[PDB]
Design an enzyme around this catalytic site. Structure first.
Site, PDB file in Angstrom:
ATOM      1  N   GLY A  76      -2.469   3.355  -5.797  1.00  0.00           N
ATOM      2  CA  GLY A  76      -1.395   3.793  -6.650  1.00  0.00           C
ATOM      3  C   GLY A  76      -0.298   4.469  -5.862  1.00  0.00           C
ATOM      4  O   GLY A  76       0.092   4.003  -4.767  1.00  0.00           O
ATOM      5  N   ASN A 111      20.126  19.310   1.509  1.00  0.00           N
ATOM      6  CA  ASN A 111      19.281  20.189   2.318  1.00  0.00           C
ATOM      7  C   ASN A 111      18.025  20.564   1.561  1.00  0.00           C
ATOM      8  O   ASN A 111      17.656  19.857   0.649  1.00  0.00           O
ATOM      9  CB  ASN A 111      20.065  21.400   2.828  1.00  0.00           C
ATOM     10  CG  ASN A 111      21.250  20.977   3.662  1.00  0.00           C
ATOM     11  OD1 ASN A 111      21.072  20.352   4.705  1.00  0.00           O
ATOM     12  ND2 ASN A 111      22.465  21.170   3.138  1.00  0.00           N
ATOM     13  N   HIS A 167       7.525  11.623  10.111  1.00  0.00           N
ATOM     14  CA  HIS A 167       6.875  12.859   9.564  1.00  0.00           C
ATOM     15  C   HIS A 167       6.175  12.546   8.237  1.00  0.00           C
ATOM     16  O   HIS A 167       5.000  12.835   8.061  1.00  0.00           O
ATOM     17  CB  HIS A 167       7.887  14.027   9.359  1.00  0.00           C
ATOM     18  CG  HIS A 167       7.271  15.276   8.774  1.00  0.00           C
ATOM     19  ND1 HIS A 167       6.905  16.391   9.490  1.00  0.00           N
ATOM     20  CD2 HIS A 167       6.939  15.558   7.482  1.00  0.00           C
ATOM     21  CE1 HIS A 167       6.355  17.283   8.646  1.00  0.00           C
ATOM     22  NE2 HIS A 167       6.362  16.822   7.410  1.00  0.00           N
ATOM     23  N   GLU A 168       6.902  11.919   7.321  1.00  0.00           N
ATOM     24  CA  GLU A 168       6.335  11.536   6.014  1.00  0.00           C
ATOM     25  C   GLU A 168       5.108  10.636   6.133  1.00  0.00           C
ATOM     26  O   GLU A 168       4.108  10.822   5.422  1.00  0.00           O
ATOM     27  CB  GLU A 168       7.403  10.868   5.122  1.00  0.00           C
ATOM     28  CG  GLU A 168       8.552  11.812   4.661  1.00  0.00           C
ATOM     29  CD  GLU A 168       8.087  13.256   4.384  1.00  0.00           C
ATOM     30  OE1 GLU A 168       7.083  13.466   3.669  1.00  0.00           O
ATOM     31  OE2 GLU A 168       8.725  14.189   4.932  1.00  0.00           O
ATOM     32  N   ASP A 219       0.831  -1.203   0.000  1.00  0.00           N
ATOM     33  CA  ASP A 219       0.000   0.000   0.000  1.00  0.00           C
ATOM     34  C   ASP A 219       0.861   1.247   0.000  1.00  0.00           C
ATOM     35  O   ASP A 219       0.615   2.209  -0.757  1.00  0.00           O
ATOM     36  CB  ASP A 219      -0.931   0.023   1.217  1.00  0.00           C
ATOM     37  CG  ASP A 219      -2.037  -1.030   1.135  1.00  0.00           C
ATOM     38  OD1 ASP A 219      -2.643  -1.191   0.063  1.00  0.00           O
ATOM     39  OD2 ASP A 219      -2.305  -1.690   2.159  1.00  0.00           O
ATOM     40  N   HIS A 255       0.492  19.673   7.390  1.00  0.00           N
ATOM     41  CA  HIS A 255       1.375  20.260   8.421  1.00  0.00           C
ATOM     42  C   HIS A 255       0.561  20.972   9.521  1.00  0.00           C
ATOM     43  O   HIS A 255      -0.564  21.430   9.303  1.00  0.00           O
ATOM     44  CB  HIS A 255       2.394  21.200   7.792  1.00  0.00           C
ATOM     45  CG  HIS A 255       3.442  20.491   6.982  1.00  0.00           C
ATOM     46  ND1 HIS A 255       3.833  20.864   5.704  1.00  0.00           N
ATOM     47  CD2 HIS A 255       4.206  19.412   7.301  1.00  0.00           C
ATOM     48  CE1 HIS A 255       4.788  20.028   5.308  1.00  0.00           C
ATOM     49  NE2 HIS A 255       5.052  19.125   6.243  1.00  0.00           N
TER      50      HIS A 255
END
Ligand code: CA
Ligand code: CA
Ligand code: ZN
Ligand code: ZN
Length: 164
Positions: free
Chosen positions: A91, A79, A119-120, A59, A129
């Site tokens: 997808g 950076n 975080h991702e 997934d 965010h």
């Protein structure tokens, strides 16, 4: 906290993930450990369970790429942008890509793969965010002790608002 506009959410709770490649900065084990522990923060605060598959269609696919990489959002070299993820969906949806040009670490030196992955994974789960500087979902990176790390309260509020 802030939810991805349109409120996309997985209509499923046991999701699989696949690590397509690795970064040579770290061992494969340490990379696999950063990802596992990153998926677990969210797991202990929601009804989601995460299962790893070595191959096949997962997934959420995880990968380290460089500059252009097929998705119209090239990375930018050292950076700057560290990584990005796709909101829930079939997808490319749910997928998390990390800039291969970054220095990835598992210490305090920039960058720490665990804090960035966790975080991702919020984005992949449907969070945008947050304006709370203490949240993990804050726009910009900051190191926090990872050894016995747990999700800030604003992030718990966030997945809770989505999944319960
Ligand atoms: Ca970059
Ligand atoms: Ca996907
Ligand atoms: Zn990408
Ligand atoms: Zn982000």
């Amino acid at each position: 906290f802030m939810l991805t506009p349109g409120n996309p959410k997985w209509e499923r709770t046991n999701l699989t993930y696949r690590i397509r490649n690795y970064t040579p900065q770290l061992s494969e084990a340490e990379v696999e450990r950063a990802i596992k522990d990153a998926f677990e923060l969210w797991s202990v605060a929601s009804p989601l369970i995460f299962t790893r598959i070595s191959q096949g269609e997962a997934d959420i696919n995880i990968a380290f790429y460089q500059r252009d990489h097929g998705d119209n959002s090239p990375f930018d070299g050292p950076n700057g942008i560290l990584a990005h993820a796709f909101q829930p969906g079939q997808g490319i949806g749910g997928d998390a890509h990390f800039d291969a040009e970054e220095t990835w670490t598992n210490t305090s030196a920039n960058y720490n793969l665990f804090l960035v992955a966790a975080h991702e994974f919020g984005h992949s789960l449907g969070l945008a965010h947050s304006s709370d500087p203490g949240a993990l979902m804050y726009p910009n990176y900051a190191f926090r002790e990872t050894s016995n790390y747990s999700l800030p309260q604003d992030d718990i509020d966030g997945i809770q608002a989505i999944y319960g």
